[PDB]
Write an enzyme that holds these catalytic residues in place. Structure first.
Site, PDB file in Angstrom:
ATOM      1  N   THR A 146      -4.936   0.822  -4.055  1.00 52.11           N
ATOM      2  CA  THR A 146      -3.747   0.590  -4.864  1.00 52.11           C
ATOM      3  C   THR A 146      -4.069   0.540  -6.352  1.00 52.11           C
ATOM      4  OG1 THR A 146      -3.998  -1.795  -4.575  1.00 52.11           O
ATOM      5  CG2 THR A 146      -2.672  -0.600  -2.956  1.00 52.11           C
ATOM      6  N   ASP A 151     -12.659  -6.987   2.542  1.00 52.13           N
ATOM      7  CA  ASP A 151     -12.558  -7.363   1.138  1.00 52.13           C
ATOM      8  C   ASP A 151     -13.457  -8.551   0.830  1.00 52.13           C
ATOM      9  OD1 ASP A 151     -10.779  -5.329   0.730  1.00 52.13           O
ATOM     10  OD2 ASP A 151      -8.988  -6.599   0.819  1.00 52.13           O
ATOM     11  N   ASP A 174       0.857  -1.176   0.000  1.00 50.19           N
ATOM     12  CA  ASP A 174       0.000   0.000   0.000  1.00 50.19           C
ATOM     13  C   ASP A 174       0.895   1.228   0.000  1.00 50.19           C
ATOM     14  OD1 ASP A 174      -1.927   1.933   0.219  1.00 50.19           O
ATOM     15  OD2 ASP A 174      -2.596   1.369   2.228  1.00 50.19           O
TER      16      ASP A 174
END
Lengths: 534, 513, 510
Positions: free
Chosen positions: B84, B381, B50
Site C-alpha cells: 500500500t 509484519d 489493500d
C-alpha cells in the site's frame, strides 16, 4: 486506405499504396526512433492483454510485432536481418528505410534506363562504405595509448560505474587473452564472452584478481570433506557419485523391492572407492562432477571423501584442455569400482588451493596444454560485481569487433553527418537524376542520430550543429585523427571526446546497415504490374 | 501485431491509474484510515485497505496498474509488507513530475531525479534512523508493534511481537548463512487453526503438521528421528500389473489396491525397525500407514527431502537405510522442543528449533481458526521487523516526517544540486510530503500549514525522528511517540517506488502482441 | 445564479479559471512584446489597416472582452505607461503569470488572502530589496550617450536592433533642453513623422516640425503672433443655388469675387489683428494666399487637430473657424517661426527655446509610415521612459538581469518568513522568470535552462537573457552592461502596479 478504393488486394495502384506504404513504412519505424540508441526508451509491449514485454530493442519489438503491409513486412526482415547480422544496427537500418522509399521510386519511375536509379542509393553506400572503412578518427580500439588497456579503459569509460577501468582496463586485456580458442582467418582475437570471470563480494568495491590459468570454482562450505592437498596435478572427471542410486535400470514395479535396495546398498559405498583409485594414481587434487543428493551430500559430508566435486564444468572443460587432462579416460560405466589412470590427470607446475573471499577455487598454476586466465572481480557484493562485469563486456566486444575489423567508424549517425552533406555534395556535381538520388539518399541519413539525440534530449539541432560544422571542405577528412569530430556517443546521444569508447561500433555493422537501408528502397519495388484475385 | 502508442497520452494514462489507485489507500494506510469498497456487478461490496486486493477483483488497467500490482508484490515479496506504500509513493512521483517536467521538456533528469531523490532518502534516513537493541524483545517490540499496525491492527501485535521477537533470531537458512534478513521459508508463519490465544505458544523452529497427524502415531518422543526410505522403505512404487480375468469381480478391485499395499509391505519393513518417525518423499499410503501408527511410529508422508532434510537437521534426525542398517546416522537431537499440539484429532507437531536449517515455521493461535490470518500477517509484519531490526537497528521514526525528511532535504539539496536538474529534483521534492500530510489532512485543519510547521520543524528542529504525529497531527518526536518507520521499509518503498515510475515515463508505447 | 437574479459574469471557478485565464490570454503576447523583441503583431484598428508592433497597450485598448479582468489591469499597465514609457510590455505579463500560481494554490487550496498577502509583503520586501538592486543611476541629459544608453533598453523592450541610431537620435532631439527635473514634455519635443527620405533620415529640428505645406511666404515675423484657426476658411464663396455653385446666370458673378474681398478683409484682419502666421484647417485660396502673400502672413492650408491642438497647446494659440475677422488671443509664442523643407517636405516651423517650454521637435523622416509610426512607438516609449523626471534614474539591470537576483532574493527569504504566506511569498519569486522566459521565448530556449544558468550566475545584476543566441545557449547577456540598464522606478512600479490589479482581480467573485 487512401485515394482509390475501387480494387482490393492491396492494389491501390501507385502513389496511394506507395504512400500507404510510406505510411506503413513511417508507421513501423516509429517505435525504433524512440527506442534508438541506449537513450532509446524501454517499451513495455502487451503480448496478449496481461501478457506484455518490456523491450527497447526494435528488432525484438518487431519480432513480437506482425507485418500488416509489405512496407511493414520488408523492413521487419531487413531490420531483423541487420539484427541477424549482429544486433548492432537493428534500430539503425530501420528508420532510414521509411524516407528513401518515397525517395527511391520518384527517380526510378522516370525510367530512361530504369535500371540504375536506386544505385544512386547504392553507390552512395559504396561511397559511404569506403569512407566508413576510413574512420579511425573516432572509436579506436585498434590501438590506444595503452592500446586495449586504455581502449578498454575508455571502454570502461564508455561503460563506467566507478573508477573501474583501472584494473578493469587490464582485465579486458586479460580477458581477450584469457580465452584461447581456434578462430579463423588467423585471428588472435578470441571470443570475449567465454572468458572465465568470477564475482567476489567484499574487500574493495573496485578491484580485480587475475588467476594464473583458468580459475575453477569448486564447492566449499557444502562438502566439508578435504579436497585439499597442494599438488602439481588435477584429475579432471566427468563422473558422478551417488549414495542412493549410482547405476539405474531397476524398476519400482518389480515384486521384489530387494532389487532396488541391493544396488542402492552396494553402489552407495563404491562412491568413495573411485577416489581411492584416483588418489593412488598420484592424484591429490581430483576434479569430480557433482550431482550428489542432499542426503548423499551430508553422507559424503559425514562419511567423508577425498575429491574436488561440483566444480564448474565450463572451467573444468577449459582446464582439462588447459592442464592437459581429459574429463573421461577409463570411464566405461557409472560404477565407482573403476580404476583411475593418469590420462585424466591435468599437468601443472603446481595445483595449489587458494581460498580467497571465503571462496575456495581450484586455481591451476601453469595450465600446460594451453594458455589460460580468469579474472575474479572484487566488489562490495556480486551485484556490485554484476555492475562492473557488464561494464566490462562492452569493453570486450568493441575490442573484439575491432579485433574483428581493424577499420572502424564511430558508432551512430555521426558518420552520416560527414557522409550526408559530403554525399549530397558527392551528388551535386552529378546533377540530373544523380544529384537527386545521392543527395535524396544522404538527406535521409540524418534521421538516425538526431532522433537518437532527442532520445537523449540532446537538442538534435545541437547534434547537427556540432558534427557537420566540423565536417567541411576544410575537413572532408576523417583522417585517422580529429581535425574534425565525427564521433557520437550513443548512451550520451551527444558527440563526446571519446575516440576509443567501447560503445561505438566498427566498420562491420555500419557497412551493412547502409545497404540494408538502400535495400528497403528497392526491396518493395520488385513487383511488376499489379492485380487483384477473386 | 504491430501497435504504436505515443507521448503524454500513455504517460498520462500512466499518471491516471496508479494515482487514482493512490487515493483511497493513502487515506487507508496509517492510523488514519478509510476503506476501498469494490462494487461487484451484483452489488457485492469488498472493502479493504489493500487496493491490490481490490485491483485484482476488477479490471487492472495496463499502463500504470499492471506494473503497480507487481511493485505492490515486490515490496511485499521482499520485506513482507508495503503493497500500500509503494503504490501511493510511486503515484506521488508519477503524478506531478513528468507533464510538468515534460512541459519543461526532458525525460532524462526526470529518470535521473529518481536516483538522486532516492539516495537522499538513503542519506537522510540512516543519519536520522534511530538504532534499537536487537537483543531486546522490547526495543524491537516498539518498532515491531509499529510495523504490526500497518493498517488497523495493534491487537495481535503484542502477541505477534513475542513470537517474532523469538523466531527471526533463531531463523537460519539451510545454508544458515545469515540469520537476520531471510526468506519466508526460513522463517515460515503457518497459522494453526482453533484453540485460543493461550495456545499461541511461540514456535521458533519448523513445524510438521504431517509428523503426527493421528493419535495412533508416535506420542511425544522428545527427539524424533525421521528415517528416510532407502531400506526401511525398500523401493517399490510400482504395481504387479497382474493379468486380466473376467471370472472374479475382485480382480478389478484388487489390482488398484496393489499400488498402496506395496508401501504396506514396506511399512511392514518399517515396523521391524521402529523408526520413531518415518519420512517418505515417494509418499506412504494410508492403507500402508495403519501399520506404522500402531507401532507408536508416527509417519511424515508426502513431504520432500529438503522439507525433511532441514528438519532432519532441525529435529536432529538420523537419516538411514534402516535403524539397524548403517547409512551413517545423523545426530539424535538437533532441537530442544518437540511439541505436538492437537486441535481436534488432527495433531500439529511443532518442533522448536534453535539456529537450525528448519523452516522456522512459527506457531500462532488466534481465539479461533479465523483471526489466525491476521496474526500471520501480524507475525510476518512482525518477523519483518525482527528480520529488519536484526538487519537495521536504525529505522526512522516518523509520522511521515520521514516522508518529509527526504522531501525537505531534497529542496535543501535542490538548492545545492542546481542545474536544470534541480527543477525535477525540486519537483520530485514535493511528492514525498503528501502521504503523511494526507494522514494529517485526514486529521484536519490546515495540513499544509502543519506541513509548513513540519517544514519549519524540519530543518530547524528535526527531519523525521522528531516529526509530526500521523493520526493526531501534532509535531512530536516519533520515537517519543513510538511510531517507527522501518529503514529498510522506507529504503524499499521509494526504491521500489522510484523504479516503477522510471519505466512509466520510459513507456509511451505498448503493442497488442 | 440559481435564481434569475444576481447580475454577474465573474465568479468561483470562472474566477479561479476564466478571469485568470482571460488575464492569461493577453499577457501571452506581452511576453513576445517586452525586452528584445523579434516578434511582430499585425493589428487592424477599425481602419482594417494593418499595423505591426510589439506593444500591448496600443493593441489591448482595442481588444474587447466580456470581463473587467482584462479591462481593469490595462489601467495599471496604463498607470505604468502614464508614469513610465516602457516596461508596460512587461507590466502585464508578471501579474498574469504571478496570478496563475493562485489558481494552482487554489487547486492546492490556499485562501484568497493567504495567496494575496504573501505576494504583498514580498512585494514590500521587493520594494524593500528592489532599490537595493539599483545598479546605477542616470546622469546627464546634455550627454547623448548617458541618455541614449538607457533609451535603447525601452526601444529594446519594443524593438531590438533599431535602438542604436534611435537612442542617440533621441537625446539629439535634446531630451536635454528640459532639465528632466520636475519637467519634461512630449508635445514640445513632439515626434513629427515625414514619410519619405529614409527611416534613418529621421532627423531633429528643434522647434516645431509641421509636415503640412508651408504657404504664403515665411512668417511676417519669426516671433510670429500666431493666430491658429480651425477653419478660418469655410469658404468665403457660398455653395448655394442651382449647380451647387450657381442657379441663375447672374449668380456666378457674385460667388467668385465675394470670396476674395471677404478673405481680403479676412486676411487683412489677419494683419489687422497682427497674426504673423495664418493657420487654416479650412481650405487654402490663392487670393487669400496672395492676400497672405500681400500681408506676408505665412499660411497653413490644412490641419489635423494635432496641428491645431499642438498649435493650441504649444503656441497658446486657439484654433477657431473665422468667417469673422481674426482676433489675436492665440497671439504669439515661438521666437522663431519659419518655413522650412525638412525631408525637403514643406515644413511649418515654429521654434522657441527655453529650459522649460522649448519645442525641440522630433522630426521623423521615414520610408514607411507603418514603420515610422512603430519607429515612433519605441522612441515614444523610450523618451517616455526617459521621462522619469529623475536625471539620475537610480538604474537597475535593464532587460531584466534583476529577476534572477530577486528570484533568488525572495523565495529563499520567502521560506525564512514562515507560514503559508511563505508559499505565496515563494510563489512571489517565481513569475520573475517571465521576461527571462519571454526573451527566451523570442530567443527560443527554456526559461529553466535560462534560470538554472542565471541562478548559476548567482549574484550578478549583469548577465541575463536578451536576443540572439547569448540569450539562448548561455542565456547570458549582460543586462547590467550591454549598455542596457533600466530605471528602478519603471521597474519599481511594475511590481507595485502588477501587485495591485492582480491581487485585486482575484478578490472579485462577481
Amino acid at each position: 486506405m487512401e485515394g482509390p478504393l475501387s480494387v482490393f488486394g492491396d492494389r491501390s495502384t501507385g502513389e496511394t499504396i506507395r504512400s500507404q506504404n510510406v505510411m506503413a513504412a513511417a508507421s513501423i519505424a516509429n517505435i525504433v526512433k524512440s527506442s534508438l540508441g541506449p537513450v532509446g526508451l524501454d517499451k513495455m509491449l502487451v503480448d496478449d492483454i496481461g501478457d506484455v514485454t518490456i523491450t527497447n530493442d526494435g528488432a525484438t519489438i518487431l519480432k513480437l510485432l506482425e507485418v500488416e503491409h509489405p512496407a511493414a513486412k520488408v523492413l521487419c526482415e531487413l531490420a531483423d536481418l541487420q539484427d541477424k547480422e549482429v544486433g548492432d544496427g537493428t534500430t539503425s537500418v530501420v528508420i532510414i528505410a521509411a524516407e528513401l522509399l518515397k525517395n527511391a521510386d520518384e527517380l526510378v519511375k522516370q525510367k530512361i534506363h530504369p535500371t540504375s536509379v536506386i544505385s544512386g542509393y547504392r553507390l552512395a553506400c559504396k561511397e559511404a562504405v569506403r569512407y566508413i572503412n576510413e574512420n579511425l578518427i573516432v572509436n579506436t580500439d585498434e590501438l590506444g595509448r595503452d592500446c586495449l588497456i586504455n581502449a578498454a579503459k575508455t571502454s570502461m569509460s564508455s561503460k563506467i560505474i566507478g573508477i573501474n577501468g583501472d584494473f578493469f582496463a587490464n582485465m579486458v586485456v586479460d580477458a581477450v587473452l584469457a580465452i584461447k580458442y581456434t578462430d579463423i582467418r588467423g585471428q588472435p582475437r578470441y571470443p570475449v564472452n567465454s572468458v572465465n570471470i568470477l564475482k567476489a563480494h567484499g574487500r574493495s568495491q573496485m578491484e580485480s584478481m587475475l588467476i594464473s590459468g583458468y580459475a575453477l570454482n569448486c564447492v566449499v562450505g557444502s562438502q566439508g570433506m578435504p579436497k585439499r592437498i597442494v599438488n602439481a596435478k588435477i584429475a579432471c572427471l566427468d563422473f558422478s557419485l551417488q549414495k542412493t542410486k549410482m547405476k539405474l535400470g531397476v524398476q519400482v514395479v518389480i515384486t521384489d523391492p530387494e532389487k532396488l535396495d541391493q544396488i542402492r546398498q552396494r553402489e552407495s559405498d563404491i562412491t568413495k572407492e573411485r577416489i581411492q583409485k584416483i588418489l593412488a594414481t598420484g592424484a591429490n587434487v581430483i576434479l569430480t562432477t557433482g550431482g550428489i543428493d542432499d542426503m548423499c551430500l551430508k553422507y559424503f559430508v559425514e562419511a567423508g571423501a577425498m575429491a574436488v566435486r561440483r566444480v564448474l564444468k565450463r572451467d573444468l572443460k577449459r582446464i582439462a584442455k588447459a592442464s592437459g587432462a581429459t574429463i573421461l579416460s577409463t570411464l566405461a560405466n557409472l560404477e565407482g569400482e573403476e580404476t583411475f589412470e593418469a590420462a585424466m590427470l591435468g599437468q601443472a607446475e603446481e595445483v595449489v588451493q587458494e581460498r580467497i573471499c571465503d571462496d575456495e577455487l581450484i586455481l591451476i598454476k601453469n595450465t600446460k596444454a594451453r594458455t589460460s586466465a580468469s579474472i575474479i572481480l572484487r566488489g562490495a557484493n556480486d551485484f556490485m560485481c554484476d555492475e562492473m562485469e557488464r561494464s566490462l563486456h562492452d569493453a570486450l566486444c568493441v575490442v573484439k569487433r575491432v579485433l574483428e575489423s581493424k577499420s572502424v567508424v564511430p558508432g551512430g549517425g555521426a558518420v552520416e553527418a560527414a557522409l550526408s552533406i559530403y554525399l549530397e555534395n558527392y551528388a551535386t556535381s552529378m546533377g540530373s537524376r544523380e544529384q537527386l538520388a545521392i543527395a535524396e539518399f544522404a538527406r535521409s541519413l540524418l534521421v538516425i542520430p538526431n532522433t537518437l539525440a532527442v532520445n537523449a534530449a540532446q537538442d538534435s539541432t545541437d547534434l547537427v550543429a556540432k558534427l557537420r560544422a566540423f565536417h567541411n571542405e576544410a575537413q572532408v577528412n576523417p583522417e585517422r585523427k580529429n581535425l574534425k569530430w565525427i564521433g557520437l556517443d550513443l548512451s550520451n546521444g551527444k558527440p563526446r571526446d571519446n575516440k576509443q569508447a567501447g560503445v561505438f561500433e566498427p566498420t562491420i555493422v555500419k557497412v551493412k546497415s547502409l545497404k540494408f537501408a538502400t535495400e528497403a528502397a528497392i526491396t518493395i519495388l520488385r513487383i511488376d504490374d499489379l492485380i487483384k484475385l477473386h | 501485431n504491430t501497435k504504436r502508442e505515443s507521448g503524454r497520452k500513455v504517460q498520462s494514462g500512466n499518471i491516471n491509474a496508479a494515482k487514482t489507485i493512490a487515493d483511497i489507500i493513502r487515506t487507508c494506510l496509517g492510523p488514519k484510515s478509510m476503506m476501498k469498497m469494490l462494487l461487484d456487478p451484483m452489488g457485492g461490496i469488498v472493502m479493504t485497505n489493500d487496493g491490490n486486493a481490490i485491483l485484482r477483483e476488477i479490471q487492472v488497467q495496463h499502463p500504470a496498474a499492471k506494473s503497480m500490482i507487481e511493485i505492490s508484490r515486490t515490496q511485499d515479496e521482499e520485506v513482507g509488507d508495503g503493497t500500500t506504500s509503494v503504490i501511493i509513493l510511486a503515484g506521488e512521483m508519477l503524478s506531478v513530475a513528468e507533464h510538468f517536467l515534460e512541459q519543461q521538456m526532458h525525460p532524462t533528469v526526470v529518470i535521473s531525479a529518481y536516483r538522486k531523490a532516492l539516495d537522499d532518502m538513503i542519506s537522510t534516513l540512516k543519519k536520522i534512523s534511530i538504532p534499537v537493541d536487537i537483543s531486546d524483545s522490547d526495543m524491537m517490540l516498539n518498532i515491531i508493534n509499529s510495523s504490526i499496525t500497518t493498517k488497523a491492527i495493534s491487537r495481535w501485535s503484542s502477541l505477534a511481537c513475542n513470537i517474532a521477537l523469538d523466531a527471526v533470531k533463531m531463523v537460519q537458512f539451510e545454508e544458515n548463512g545469515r540469520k537476520e534478513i531471510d526468506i519466508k521459508k526460513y522463517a515460515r508463519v503457518e497459522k494453526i487453526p482453533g484453540g485460543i490465544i493461550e495456545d499461541s505458544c511461540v514456535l521458533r523452529g519448523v513445524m510438521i503438521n504431517k509428523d503426527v497427524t493421528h493419535p495412533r502415531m508416535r506420542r511425544y518422543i522428545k527427539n524424533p528421528r525421521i528415517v528416510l526410505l532407502d531400506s526401511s522403505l525398500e523401493y517399490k512404487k510400482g504395481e504387479s500389473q497382474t493379468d486380466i480375468e473376467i471370472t472374479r469381480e475382485e480382480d478389478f478391485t484388487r489390482i488398484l489396491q496393489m499400488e498402496e499395499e506395496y508401501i504396506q509391505q514396506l511399512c511392514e519393513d518399517i515396523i521391524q525397525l521402529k523408526p520413531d518417525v518415518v519420512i517418505t518423499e515417494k509418499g506412504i499410503s494410508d492403507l500402508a500407514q495403519h501399520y506404522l501408527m500402531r507401532a507408536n511410529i508416527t509417519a511424515i508422508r508426502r513431504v520432500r527431502k529438503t522439507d525433511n532434510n532441514r528438519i532432519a537437521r532441525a529435529c536432529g534426525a538420523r537419516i538411514v537405510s534402516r535403524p539397524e542398517e548403517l547409512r551413517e546416522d545423523d545426530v539424535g537431537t538437533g532441537a530442544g522442543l518437540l511439541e505436538i499440539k492437537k486441535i481436534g484429532d488432527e495433531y500439529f507437531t511443532f518442533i522448536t528449533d534453535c539456529k537450525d536449517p528448519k523452516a522456522c515455521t512459527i506457531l500462532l493461535r488466534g481465539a479461533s481458526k479465523e483471526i489466525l490470518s491476521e496474526v500471520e500477517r501480524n507475525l510476518q509484519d512482525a518477523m519483518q521487523v525482527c528480520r529488519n531490526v536484526l538487519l537495521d537497528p536504525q529505522l526512522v521514526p516518523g509520522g511521515g516526517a520521514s516522508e518529509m525528511a527526504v522531501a525537505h532535504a531534497l529542496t535543501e539539496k535542490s538548492k545545492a544540486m542546481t542545474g536544470v536538474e534541480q527543477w525535477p529534483y525540486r519537483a520530485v521534492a514535493q511528492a514525498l510530503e503528501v502521504i503523511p500530510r494526507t494522514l494529517i489532512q485526514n486529521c484536519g485543519a490546515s495540513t499544509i500549514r502543519l506541513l509548513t510547521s513540519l517544514r519549519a520543524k524540519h530543518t530547524q528542529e528535526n527531519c523525521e525522528t522528531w516529526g509530526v504525529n500521523g493520526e493526531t497531527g501534532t509535531l512530536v518526536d516519533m520515537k517519543e511517540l513510538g511510531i517507527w518507520e522501518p529503514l529498510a521499509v522506507k529504503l524499499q518503498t521509494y526504491k521500489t517506488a522510484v523504479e516503477t515510475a522510471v519505466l512509466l515515463l520510459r513507456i509511451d508505447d505498448i503493442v497488442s502482441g | 445564479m440559481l435564481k434569475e437574479g444576481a447580475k454577474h459574469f465573474s465568479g468561483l471557478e470562472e474566477a479561479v479559471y476564466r478571469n485568470i485565464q482571460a488575464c492569461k490570454e493577453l499577457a501571452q503576447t506581452t511576453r513576445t512584446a517586452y525586452g528584445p523583441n523579434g516578434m511582430n503583431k499585425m493589428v487592424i484598428n477599425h481602419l482594417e489597416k494593418l499595423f505591426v508592433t510589439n506593444d500591448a497597450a496600443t493593441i489591448l485598448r482595442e481588444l474587447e472582452v466580456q470581463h473587467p479582468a482584462a479591462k481593469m489591469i490595462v489601467m495599471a499597465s496604463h498607470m505604468q505607461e502614464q508614469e513610465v514609457g516602457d516596461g508596460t510590455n512587461f507590466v502585464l505579463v508578471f501579474a498574469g503569470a504571478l496570478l496563475e500560481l493562485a489558481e494552482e494554490l487554489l487547486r492546492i487550496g490556499l485562501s484568497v488572502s493567504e495567496v494575496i498577502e504573501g505576494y504583498e509583503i514580498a512585494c514590500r520586501k521587493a520594494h524593500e530589496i528592489l532599490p537595493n538592486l539599483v545598479c546605477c543611476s542616470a546622469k546627464n541629459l546634455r550627454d547623448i550617450d548617458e541618455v541614449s544608453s538607457l533609451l535603447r533598453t525601452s526601444i529594446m523592450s519594443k524593438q531590438y536592433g533599431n535602438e542604436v541610431f534611435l537612442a542617440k537620435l533621441i537625446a539629439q532631439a535634446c531630451v536635454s533642453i528640459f532639465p528632466d527635473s520636475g519637467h519634461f514634455n512630449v508635445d514640445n519635443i513632439r515626434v513629427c513623422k515625414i514619410l519619405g527620405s529614409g527611416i534613418s533620415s529621421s532627423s531633429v529640428l528643434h522647434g516645431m516640425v509641421f509636415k503640412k505645406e508651408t504657404e504664403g511666404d515665411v512668417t511676417s515675423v519669426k516671433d510670429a503672433k500666431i493666430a491658429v484657426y480651425s477653419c478660418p476658411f469655410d469658404g468665403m464663396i457660398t455653395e448655394t443655388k442651382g449647380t451647387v455653385l450657381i442657379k441663375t446666370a447672374e449668380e456666378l458673378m457674385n460667388f467668385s469675387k465675394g470670396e476674395e474681398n471677404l478673405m481680403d478683409a479676412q486676411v487683412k484682419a489677419i494683419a489687422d489683428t497682427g497674426a504673423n502666421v495664418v493657420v487654416t484647417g479650412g481650405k487654402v485660396a490663392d487670393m487669400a494666399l496672395h492676400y497672405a502673400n500681400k500681408y506676408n502672413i505665412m499660411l497653413v492650408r490644412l490641419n489635423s487637430k494635432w496641428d491645431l491642438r499642438r498649435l493650441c497647446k504649444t503656441v497658446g494659440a486657439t484654433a477657431l473657424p473665422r468667417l469673422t475677422p481674426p482676433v489675436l488671443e492665440e497671439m504669439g509664442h515661438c521666437d522663431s517661426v519659419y518655413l522650412s523643407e525638412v525631408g525637403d517636405t514643406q515644413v511649418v516651423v515654429f521654434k522657441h527655446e527655453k529650459e522649460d517650454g522649448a519645442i525641440s521637435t522630433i522630426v521623423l523622416r521615414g520610408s514607411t509610415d507603418n514603420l515610422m509610426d512603430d519607429i515612433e512607438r519605441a522612441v515614444d516609449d523610450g523618451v517616455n521612459t526617459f521621462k522619469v523626471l529623475t536625471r539620475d534614474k537610480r538604474l537597475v539591470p535593464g532587460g531584466g538581469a534583476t529577476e534572477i537576483e530577486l528570484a533568488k532574493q525572495i523565495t529563499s527569504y520567502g521560506e525564512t518568513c514562515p507560514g503559508l504566506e511563505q508559499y505565496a511569498i515563494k510563489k512571489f519569486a517565481e513569475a520573475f522568470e517571465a521576461i527571462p522566459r519571454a526573451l527566451a521565448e523570442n530567443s527560443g530556449v527554456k526559461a529553466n535552462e535560462v534560470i538554472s544558468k542565471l541562478y548559476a550566475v548567482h549574484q550578478e545584476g549583469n548577465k541575463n537573457v536578451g536576443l540572439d543566441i547569448e540569450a539562448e545557449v548561455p542565456a547570458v547577456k549582460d543586462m547590467l552592461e550591454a549598455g542596457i540598464l533600466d530605471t528602478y522606478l519603471g521597474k519599481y512600479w511594475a511590481i507595485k502596479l502588477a501587485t495591485n490589479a492582480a491581487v485585486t482581480v482575484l478578490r472579485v467573485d462577481q
